[PDB]
Design an enzyme around this catalytic site. Structure first.
Site, PDB file in Angstrom:
ATOM      1  N   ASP A  95       0.861  -1.170   0.000  1.00 11.06           N
ATOM      2  CA  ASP A  95       0.000   0.000   0.000  1.00 11.06           C
ATOM      3  C   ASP A  95       0.898   1.222   0.000  1.00 11.06           C
ATOM      4  O   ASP A  95       2.108   1.126   0.245  1.00 11.06           O
ATOM      5  CB  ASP A  95      -0.935  -0.007   1.221  1.00 11.06           C
ATOM      6  CG  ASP A  95      -1.733   1.290   1.369  1.00 11.06           C
ATOM      7  OD1 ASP A  95      -2.562   1.564   0.476  1.00 11.06           O
ATOM      8  OD2 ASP A  95      -1.536   2.027   2.372  1.00 11.06           O
ATOM      9  N   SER A  96       0.286   2.381  -0.279  1.00 11.03           N
ATOM     10  CA  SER A  96       0.988   3.661  -0.207  1.00 11.03           C
ATOM     11  C   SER A  96       1.431   4.011   1.208  1.00 11.03           C
ATOM     12  O   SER A  96       2.303   4.869   1.377  1.00 11.03           O
ATOM     13  CB  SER A  96       0.095   4.780  -0.739  1.00 11.03           C
ATOM     14  OG  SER A  96      -1.001   5.038   0.122  1.00 11.03           O
TER      15      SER A  96
ATOM     16  N   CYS B  67      -3.706  -0.701  -2.405  1.00  8.57           N
ATOM     17  CA  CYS B  67      -3.906   0.722  -2.653  1.00  8.57           C
ATOM     18  C   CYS B  67      -4.608   0.954  -3.989  1.00  8.57           C
ATOM     19  O   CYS B  67      -4.146   0.487  -5.041  1.00  8.57           O
ATOM     20  CB  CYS B  67      -2.549   1.430  -2.626  1.00  8.57           C
ATOM     21  SG  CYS B  67      -2.577   3.118  -3.088  1.00  8.57           S
TER      22      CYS B  67
ATOM     23  N   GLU C 124      -7.023   9.948   8.694  1.00 11.17           N
ATOM     24  CA  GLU C 124      -5.763   9.676   9.378  1.00 11.17           C
ATOM     25  C   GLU C 124      -5.633  10.477  10.664  1.00 11.17           C
ATOM     26  O   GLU C 124      -5.044   9.984  11.630  1.00 11.17           O
ATOM     27  CB  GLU C 124      -4.567   9.948   8.455  1.00 11.17           C
ATOM     28  CG  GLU C 124      -4.326   8.852   7.420  1.00 11.17           C
ATOM     29  CD  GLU C 124      -3.024   9.029   6.640  1.00 11.17           C
ATOM     30  OE1 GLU C 124      -2.284   9.997   6.927  1.00 11.17           O
ATOM     31  OE2 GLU C 124      -2.742   8.202   5.734  1.00 11.17           O
TER      32      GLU C 124
ATOM     33  N   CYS D 201     -10.901   3.799  -2.234  1.00  9.98           N
ATOM     34  CA  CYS D 201      -9.715   4.277  -1.553  1.00  9.98           C
ATOM     35  C   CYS D 201      -9.577   3.509  -0.241  1.00  9.98           C
ATOM     36  O   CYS D 201     -10.571   3.151   0.382  1.00  9.98           O
ATOM     37  CB  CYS D 201      -9.802   5.790  -1.320  1.00  9.98           C
ATOM     38  SG  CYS D 201      -8.428   6.477  -0.350  1.00  9.98           S
TER      39      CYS D 201
ATOM     40  N   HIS E  87      -8.719   4.401   2.726  1.00  7.29           N
ATOM     41  CA  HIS E  87      -9.128   5.017   3.981  1.00  7.29           C
ATOM     42  C   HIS E  87     -10.636   5.050   4.154  1.00  7.29           C
ATOM     43  O   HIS E  87     -11.115   5.123   5.289  1.00  7.29           O
ATOM     44  CB  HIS E  87      -8.571   6.442   4.079  1.00  7.29           C
ATOM     45  CG  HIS E  87      -7.080   6.508   4.226  1.00  7.29           C
ATOM     46  ND1 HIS E  87      -6.215   5.826   3.396  1.00  7.29           N
ATOM     47  CD2 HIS E  87      -6.301   7.197   5.098  1.00  7.29           C
ATOM     48  CE1 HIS E  87      -4.968   6.088   3.753  1.00  7.29           C
ATOM     49  NE2 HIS E  87      -4.993   6.918   4.782  1.00  7.29           N
TER      50      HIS E  87
HETATM   51  N1  LIG Z   1      -3.760   4.191  -0.258  1.00  7.45           N
HETATM   52  C1  LIG Z   1      -4.320   5.319  -1.000  1.00  7.45           C
HETATM   53  C2  LIG Z   1      -4.776   6.429  -0.038  1.00  7.45           C
HETATM   54  C3  LIG Z   1      -3.624   7.186   0.611  1.00  7.45           C
HETATM   55  C4  LIG Z   1      -2.720   7.869  -0.404  1.00  7.45           C
HETATM   56  O1  LIG Z   1      -3.191   8.816  -1.084  1.00  7.45           O
HETATM   57  O2  LIG Z   1      -1.539   7.453  -0.529  1.00  7.45           O
HETATM   58  C5  LIG Z   1      -5.485   4.881  -1.871  1.00  7.45           C
HETATM   59  O3  LIG Z   1      -6.099   3.826  -1.618  1.00  7.45           O
HETATM   60  O4  LIG Z   1      -5.837   5.580  -2.834  1.00  7.45           O
END
Ligand SMILES: N[C@H](CCC(=O)O)C(=O)O
Ligand SMILES: N[C@H](CCC(=O)O)C(=O)O
Lengths: 254, 260
Positions: free
Chosen positions: B14-15, B77, B155, B187, B189
């Site tokens: 993930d990011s 992600c 977050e 997304c 989050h």
């Molecule tokens: N993990 C990213 C969200 C957080 C980011 O922007 O890095 C997503 O699912 O798009």
């Protein structure tokens, strides 16, 4: 009450932590008091008056401590005692049957809805009766008694448990349900397995997810959200049985 | 290697920390699977980046996980899946599961009026990955909206009340006007906003969780290729790594894992 008062959540045991974890996910600033009745459960095989006695004892303790809202996380306890709870307590009560019922009626495409749960939940007809007000729907309810033991033992994929689910779910497949209510605290840990059994077209509805979204709605509308600038939230977990046995099994659900 | 040993781990990346919602959902379903999670906190967020920048960051982590011998790769992600899934099909030979396609298939099956909404980062939405993935779905109309503030709101723990409701009513207004009855939470989050979003969209809108559908896909994939780690193997090992600051990763991970 006060926005600073905790939210009470209780369950037959440890599986209600799926509901508590979903509530906490949506509401990181709420104080929480969770009680799992490991001393007296499982509620699954009990009679309705037996369940109600046990659940209302915990309900009375939590309301007596000043919670602003009471969440019945157990589907078996919700069947046995929502009627009593409406009249017995002045705090708002959220439980796990009605939010899922409302989601399932909104989510179905052909009007054919299933539900699975413990023997006590299904034998009570809480779901069958709650769905009677839904036009153009046919309900098929099926008890899945061994699912709870398989979840707690951590056996939720593979051929043994897949065959168990195929045998339980066959009437729902025959009834061509396109929507299935997971009417038990433990069953979200089986959603992959149940989805494989039922095929891609069946929408599964989690009690934990819908109830947590409902707690958000209820606290918002009666203006009792605990503020973000309040001190760090406190979360208390209590067991009526062996606290160490509770701690060990909670790792499965947290 | 299409087929590694069932004892090999599942790689998830993930990011940053938000993909823990996908990893927790996988671990919920699959308690006996070894997990290696890598969250790219040293280069995130991906949301505001370009597609080539996201791809290069993500593939650097996929490369590591594959080289560790994972038997499957989960791109948790949505921004990263938008940017590199195409590359990953050719670059990696182990099964690749990600978060766009399972939720697309769910959304197509769950809609009643054929009107589907999706929300995500600016990168995800402007890539048109969802708009193009839905093109094969006959009699559907897609409305896609970037929701850039949702990630930092989640977050920093601000997911109910009037401020974030007003912010969400502003983002989601095109979707209400389009009369969608299905919303893909496109997304990592956004599952932590599902109560806030449900409240803004009304009760007839079915929310689709990327985490949930992708975890059910992993169960299905591993079952159908008969690569499930056995229940009688030793207890599952679950490794969580960050490419950025370790203490910040741990603190932020508390938000997505829930009570200890
Ligand atoms: N993990 C990213 C969200 C957080 C980011 O922007 O890095 C997503 O699912 O798009
Ligand atoms: N909590 C129960 C399951 C466990 C039990 O039978 O006590 C329920 O949701 O029905």
């Amino acid at each position: 009450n006060s926005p600073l008062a905790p939210v009470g959540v209780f369950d037959s045991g440890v599986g209600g932590l799926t509901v508590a974890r979903a509530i906490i996910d949506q509401l990181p600033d709420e104080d929480i008091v969770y009680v799992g009745d490991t001393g007296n459960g499982p509620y699954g095989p009990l009679t309705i008056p037996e369940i109600r006695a046990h659940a209302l004892a915990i309900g009375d303790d939590l309301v007596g401590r000043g919670v602003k809202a009471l969440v019945i996380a157990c589907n078996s306890a919700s069947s046995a005692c929502l009627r009593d709870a409406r009249e017995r307590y002045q705090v708002p009560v959220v439980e796990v049957i009605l939010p899922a019922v409302r989601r399932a009626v909104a989510a179905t495409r052909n009007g054919r809805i299933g539900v699975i749960g413990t023997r006590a939940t299904i034998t009570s007809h809480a779901y069958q009766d709650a769905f009677a007000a839904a036009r153009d729907t046919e309900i098929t309810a099926v008890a899945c008694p061994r699912f709870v033991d398989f979840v707690e033992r951590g056996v939720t994929s593979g051929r043994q448990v897949l065959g168990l689910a195929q045998g339980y779910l066959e009437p729902l497949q025959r009834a061509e349900v396109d929507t299935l209510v997971l009417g038990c605290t433990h069953y979200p840990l089986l959603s992959g397995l149940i989805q494989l059994a039922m095929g891609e077209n069946v929408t599964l509805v989690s009690s934990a997810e819908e109830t947590a979204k409902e707690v958000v709605r209820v606290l918002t509308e009666i203006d009792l959200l605990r503020p973000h600038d309040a001190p760090p939230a406190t979360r208390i977990f209590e067991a009526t049985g062996d606290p160490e046995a509770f701690t060990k099994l909670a790792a499965r659900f947290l």
